[PDB]
Each structure stands twice: as structure tokens, then as C-alpha cells.
Amino acid sequence: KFPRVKNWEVGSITYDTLSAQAQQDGPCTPRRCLGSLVFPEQLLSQARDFINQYYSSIKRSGSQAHEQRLQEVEAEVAATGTYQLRESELVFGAKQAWRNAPRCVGRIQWGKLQVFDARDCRSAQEMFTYICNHIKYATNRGNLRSAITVFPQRCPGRGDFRIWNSQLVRYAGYRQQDGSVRGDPANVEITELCIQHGWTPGNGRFDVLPLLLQAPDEPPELFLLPPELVLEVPLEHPTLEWFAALGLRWYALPAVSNMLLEIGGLEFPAAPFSGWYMSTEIGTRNLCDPHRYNILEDVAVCMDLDTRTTSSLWKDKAAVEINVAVLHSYQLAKVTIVDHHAATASFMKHLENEQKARGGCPADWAWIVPPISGSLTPVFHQEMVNYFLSPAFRYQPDPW
Amino acid sequence: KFPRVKNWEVGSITYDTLSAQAQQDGPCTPRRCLGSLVFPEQLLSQARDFINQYYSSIKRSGSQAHEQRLQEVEAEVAATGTYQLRESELVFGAKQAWRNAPRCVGRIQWGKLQVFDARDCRSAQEMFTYICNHIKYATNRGNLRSAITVFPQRCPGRGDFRIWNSQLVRYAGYRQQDGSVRGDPANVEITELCIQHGWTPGNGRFDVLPLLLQAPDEPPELFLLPPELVLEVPLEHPTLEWFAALGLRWYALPAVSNMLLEIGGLEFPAAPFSGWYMSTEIGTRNLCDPHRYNILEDVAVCMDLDTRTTSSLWKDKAAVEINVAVLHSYQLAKVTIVDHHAATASFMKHLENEQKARGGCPADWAWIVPPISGSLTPVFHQEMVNYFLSPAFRYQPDPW
Numbered sequence A, B: 001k002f003p004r005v006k007n008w009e010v011g012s013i014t015y016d017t018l019s020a021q022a023q024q025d026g027p028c029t030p031r032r033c034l035g036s037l038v039f040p041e042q043l044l045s046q047a048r049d050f051i052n053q054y055y056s057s058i059k060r061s062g063s064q065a066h067e068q069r070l071q072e073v074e075a076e077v078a079a080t081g082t083y084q085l086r087e088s089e090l091v092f093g094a095k096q097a098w099r100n101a102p103r104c105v106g107r108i109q110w111g112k113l114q115v116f117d118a119r120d121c122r123s124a125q126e127m128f129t130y131i132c133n134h135i136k137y138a139t140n141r142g143n144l145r146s147a148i149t150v151f152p153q154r155c156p157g158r159g160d161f162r163i164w165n166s167q168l169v170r171y172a173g174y175r176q177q178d179g180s181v182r183g184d185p186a187n188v189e190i191t192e193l194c195i196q197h198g199w200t201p202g203n204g205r206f207d208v209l210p211l212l213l214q215a216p217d218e219p220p221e222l223f224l225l226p227p228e229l230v231l232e233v234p235l236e237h238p239t240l241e242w243f244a245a246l247g248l249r250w251y252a253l254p255a256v257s258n259m260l261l262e263i264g265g266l267e268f269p270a271a272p273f274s275g276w277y278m279s280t281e282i283g284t285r286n287l288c289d290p291h292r293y294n295i296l297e298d299v300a301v302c303m304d305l306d307t308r309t310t311s312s313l314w315k316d317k318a319a320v321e322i323n324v325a326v327l328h329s330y331q332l333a334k335v336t337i338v339d340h341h342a343a344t345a346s347f348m349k350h351l352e353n354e355q356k357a358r359g360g361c362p363a364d365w366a367w368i369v370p371p372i373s374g375s376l377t378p379v380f381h382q383e384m385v386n387y388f389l390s391p392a393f394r395y396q397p398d399p400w
């Protein structure tokens, strides 16, 4: 009943006993594995389980306080169909959700998370203020700090609060007449939506998009982040002098804003969170994916590489230097960043810590292993077990 | 019912209808995914299914010959508890087994497999002759040809033919008294077994191991491969002149010899197959894996790289050049080899062919994506479905 998990580099063996307690069910079946794919009484059950987790965490399970809390939750759900989380529970819940995220390699930092309680938010304007304060705190002038802001939970009698943008800071993507895209191709849809809602666009490759914020049962409202709040880093290479001339740059703060936070059966459709970048996401994914900025060929040509044949590994060489530039640039600008070697090494420690703590750790191998130099990192040689635990961060349909 | 499979680079969508027809079951459940883990009547149902597959392949399903064959097989099983394959079925079966291997990126060449029928093999000595013949045919002085030699099947009241070695060509691994290992650490166990059975061990880093061949109900017999039959490639770099001095080398023929070929319920414990190398297996895994030759640091030092900090990406830079050396060296020696870019590109074509041919393709994402520069290849951005189809190549316990 317990999956044997082996590490092929050292040969060590462990058994995931935590998986046996996975809340929901994934896409896999004994007939076929779908691991590579990206995407009343029920409420009470989840609520009771979460409360049990909370009291267990503070070493007070089975106490009068524990029993009282369970009774209160039941009473509220019986009377309103929902319930109110206590401040301390929201904090605990948010940390667990990050802890439970199978695709996150930076989980060793799970317990260090600043939680901003915005459950009293009433308007899009107030949403904006909350978001600006989050960005300010999180950016901390380069010494990034992990944070999450939680807006009002989904209610049975009203619409949801939603942040239309996928991240708080993203670059516009403008479709050109010739069929090409200026800016980030991943952001074409949201870019066009902003324009449709009244935003006169820029014409650059790195235009910070306005926020399209939605209050319950109301059309989304446009808000522009003060430039002074958006910390960016100009990209240069330590030896390749011409690299800085490409005019490339990236933002400091990776802040996912389109996921749903689930705590004890309660759902928070708007709960943006942020940490700091692992260099490969910028250097490899954002800059080199064929469907993103796709700068590989241009960089290789500037590096005087032989792009005539694949065997020269011109692509690999260019990607490595682009990653070097990202690391060099962030360190120079004094903006928090972590390379894939340091990040994966820290995750191995996280796995060890979690084995002792809960007897396992939900991890998605395809996402944990970096987009470049996979086998050069320890996680590549580590077998993993992927499963769903709650509290959790979940994907949800776009509000439009 | 039919899993939706998406390519994230192009946005194309397909449905794997083939998976719903997968015979055997895998390790995954809706509770948890174990996709990253490395490891009479029943016979008749498997036999009938395979016979049906064969007749469908020659467009004669439902014919008198088809029915007569099904009846013939049923009669044989009732009279002996097993049955024999016709040569044409054996050839078809072997090809399907390769076609069905989820972890193989070279499947576009599946139809070109040359199948050698060695079911008439009478002894370990004859087994050796067959193996040497295979090596000669397959190597072809550098112009590699894919092939498989099928030895007698497993049958009741008789032992099995077995090749103890994991591959026909492997380098010895000598555990030094100081804890280290001279040669390939992955081959320590097999090296020590060869020694026990009377082999006089060498002391080099690249000593070609002898073959430990087992005939039914007989102890394994030692056989030395004539040096002239084992084609090897000395490794050098196109610009780094000192690389050649490292004395690195690798063999031309990758020939897996410890897997079990399963066809229509029948099992062939000894059926060695071979193709040609994808450069990353040698350059990245064999030479750079921590638990293998682990030459990364030494090469980085010779390259004058700053090995003090991980953020300089010295590991990545060294790995790329080692891979360049491999490609350059095999091309210079005129020995067939394929880089990861060309291999993955060909696999995308194979997926397209298979979608039209069978409505799907069992593929293990974790194994298909190369150990370096994953996202730089098209397969990384392609969702895959992993399932078991028969005929198939399966892992089996070591004979000892």
C-alpha cells in the first residue's frame, strides 16, 4: 500500500506513507498514466479534516478547543452553507497549500510566508491598493520576501473576486500585421482584453500590463501599476559585451495571480502569491521557448555559432549563456534569484525534511526537474510520487 | 474515455484512443502517480490477441487462414501448455515490441528492424556465435543497422537461455580498496561475477567485459569478445586540444541484452537488440552522471571554469562541451550517432505517424525528454500518455 521511492544516484530507499492519505483523485489510472498533462456533506468533510490539521499543528488535537472549533464550523455550515476561518487558520492554511504544491521546487521556504488578510475587501479599487502593498512588501527593493494576499472567499449568493491577469507583472504581447508578435506571445489574450477595456497600449517589447481587477458581479476595472513599484533588471552578459545591446530585461517579482486557494472546503478565487525567480524560468522558458520571446537563434548568431547543423549544439550553447546572463544580471542588480543547481539541491533537503515530518512529499518530477541540464541536478535521479493534498493551490477557468 | 493530448508550443490537440486498448496495467492510480519510477487460459487470451494483431497487419483478419491459425495455437496449448510462433509472426512481433516501447525515442525506425531467428540455438557456444554475428551485422564498420537476435523461448520443464550482461558491450568496473571505482561503477556487480567465474580482470577505465552466457539448466559460461569485433571511438574535441589527452572513449554499439521479449503470451528471456547511440546517453549520462564516470568537474577545471560557485553554470558549460566532443568524435570516426535535437525531432514525426496509424502512441515523457536542454527540444512541450501494449520488451530479474 506504500510506494517504494528510490534515488538512483545514491541508492537510498524510502516509502511514501503520506500518499495513502491523498484527498482528491488525479488523472492517472492503472490503464494509462497522464502525469505529463498540464491540467454540503462534502464541505463539512474537508472542513473537519482541515481543522484537524490545524489543531494537530499546534499540538492541541483532541482538546476542548479543538472540539469546540469543529462544532462551530458545523453550526455555521448548517446555517449559512459556508463558514468563517480564523486569522491563524488562514495563515496556517496558506502555508500548507504552498507546502502541498507538487510542482514547486522552492518548497524548502514553505514556512516563511507573509500572509496578507484581505477578506474585508469590497471593491476593485481596494483590490488594487492591496495588490500594490503586496508588491511593495514582496519586492523589498531587491531582497524579495515570499507573500500571499487573500481576498474574500467564494460565496453562494454573489460572484467571485478575480484577478484576470495570470501574474501581477507581465509584459504585453502585441500581434503585428505580418502575423508576428511584439512582446510576450503568452500574453496576447490578456493584452487584447486590456485594450478592449479601455487601455491605450504601448508599442514596446517589455510593456508592463495594467491589472484587470474584478469585484463580485461587476465588469473588471483597469489599474496601472506605478512604475516605481515594478522592479526590473536589465540583462547583460559578464563577457559577451554585445548582449547588453539586445535591450533585454525581466521583472523581479514572479507573482502568480490566477490560481484558486482551497482551504478546508473553502475556495478563494483571488489569492495572488509570490516568491522569487529560479533563473531557468527566465533564461530558458521565457526567453528561449519557441512560443515565447524565442531569442535563441539571434543570440547564437551574435555568438558566431554554426547554426547550419544541430550537431554543433549551438542551441545548447546559446541557452547556457542566456542563463548565465540572467544570473549575472540579477546578482549585479542585487535582486534575489536562485540558479537551478542551488534550487534543486535545496529541494532534496525539503524531501528529506518532509519524509521525517509526514512520511512523504507530493512531487511532480516533470516540473521539478529544470528545463535545461536536467540530469546534472540531484532531483533528476530521484523518483517521486505525485498526489493531491489539501490545502492546495488549484487551476481555475479564466473569468472570461 | 479518450485522453486529450496537447502540444503547448503549437497548441495542437489529439486524442489517444489507443490507450483504452492497453492490455496490462501500470503502477498509477487516481490516488497517486508513480510515472517517474524506473521499475493456460491467460496464455490463450494473449496468444489469440497477438494472432489477431498479425492477421490484421497483413489485412487478412477473418480469413480461413486466420481461423486455422487460432485453432492451431489452441490445439498446441492444450497438448503442450505452450505453442510455437511461425517465423513471419516472430518478425512481426519483435517489430511491434520496439514500436510499443514507451521509453524509446528512436521508434521512427521501428519498421526497419532486422530480426534474426536464433530459436534453433542448441548451446552457450552457439549463442556466442549468434551474438558475434549480430555484432558484426549491426556494427557494419560504423554504418550501424538496427537488429535483434531472438533465442529459444521459455518453456516448461527446462531452464532459460540468459545473457547475464546488461549490454553486449560494457566496460568493467573495479571497486578499489580506498572505496573508489576504476571504470564504470554501473558494472561493478557484473564485473565481479565475471571474475568469480574465472575471468582475469584488467585494470583500465575502459576494459571491455567478457560475455557471461547461460544455456538452459547450465551454469553461466564465460566468452571473450574478439577486440576486432568491438568498435570503439576515441573522444576528442574540435577546439579544446587537451580533451583528447583525457583518454576518454566509448563503444559504437548500444546493445541491450537483459530484457525479456514478450510475444502473444510467449516469453523470450534472451533476445538482445541494438540500434545506434543518441549522443546525450554517452556525453551526459554515461560520462557525467555522479554515479557513473563523473568527469564533469575534471573537464570544467581543464576548461578553466570557476567551479567555486554554481551560478557560473560551470557544470552546464562542461556538459555541453563533453556532448560536443562525443558528436564530433563519432562523426570523425564515421560511426552512426544522432544528437538529441535530431532524435526528438524525428520522434515528433513518429508521434504524427502513429496518431494516423493507430490513434495514439505510448510514450514515457520522463525518458523521451533528453537529460540536457529538455525545453530546447520539441518533445518537452508535448503531452504524452504512457501505457503498456503487447508485444513488448520487459525488465526481468537478474539470473543470479
Ligand code: HEM
Pocket (backbone or CB within 6 Å): A094, A098, A101, A103, A104, A105, A106, A107, A109, A113, A146, A147, A148, A259, A273, A274, A275, A276, A277, A278, A281, A338, A343, A367, A393
Ligand atoms: C520562494 C521562491 C520560490 C521559488 C524559487 C519557486 C519556484 C517554482 C518553480 C520553478 C515552479 C515551476 C514553474 C512554473 O510553475 O512557472 C513553481 C511552481 C509553483 N509554485 Fe513555487 N516557487 C517559489 C515560491 C512560491 C510561493 C511563495 C508559492 C505559494 C505560496 C508557490 C506556489 C507554487 C505553485 C502553486 C506552483 C505551481 C504553478 C503552476 O502549476 O502553474 N511558489 N515554483
Ligand code: HEM
Pocket (backbone or CB within 6 Å): B098, B101, B103, B104, B105, B106, B107, B109, B113, B146, B147, B148, B256, B273, B274, B275, B276, B277, B278, B281, B338, B343, B367, B393
Ligand atoms: C535505432 C536507434 C535507436 C535510438 C537512437 C534509441 C534511443 C533510445 C533511448 C535514448 C532510450 C532511453 C533509455 C536509456 O536512457 O538508456 C531508449 C530506450 C529503449 N529502447 Fe531505443 N533506441 C534505438 C533503437 C532501439 C531498438 C532497435 C530497440 C528494440 C528493438 C529499442 C528498444 C528500447 C527499449 C525497450 C528501451 C527501454 C530501455 C530501458 O528502459 O532500460 N531501441 N532508446
Ligand SMILES: O=[N+]([O-])c1ccc2cn[nH]c2c1
Pocket (backbone or CB within 6 Å): A254, A255, A256, A273, A274, A275, A276, A277, A278, A279, A281
Ligand atoms: O511564487 N511562485 O509560485 C513561483 C512560480 C514560478 C517561478 C519561477 N521561478 N520562481 C517562481 C515562483
Ligand SMILES: O=[N+]([O-])c1ccc2cn[nH]c2c1
Pocket (backbone or CB within 6 Å): B254, B255, B256, B273, B274, B275, B276, B277, B278, B279, B281
Ligand atoms: O538499443 N537500445 O534500446 C538503446 C538503448 C539506449 C540508447 C541510447 N542511444 N541509443 C540507444 C539504444
Ligand code: NA
Pocket (backbone or CB within 6 Å): A254, A281, A286
Ligand atoms: Na514567469
Ligand SMILES: [Zn+2]
Pocket (backbone or CB within 6 Å): A028, A029, A032, A033, A034, A035, B028, B029, B032, B033, B034, B035
Ligand atoms: Zn501517472
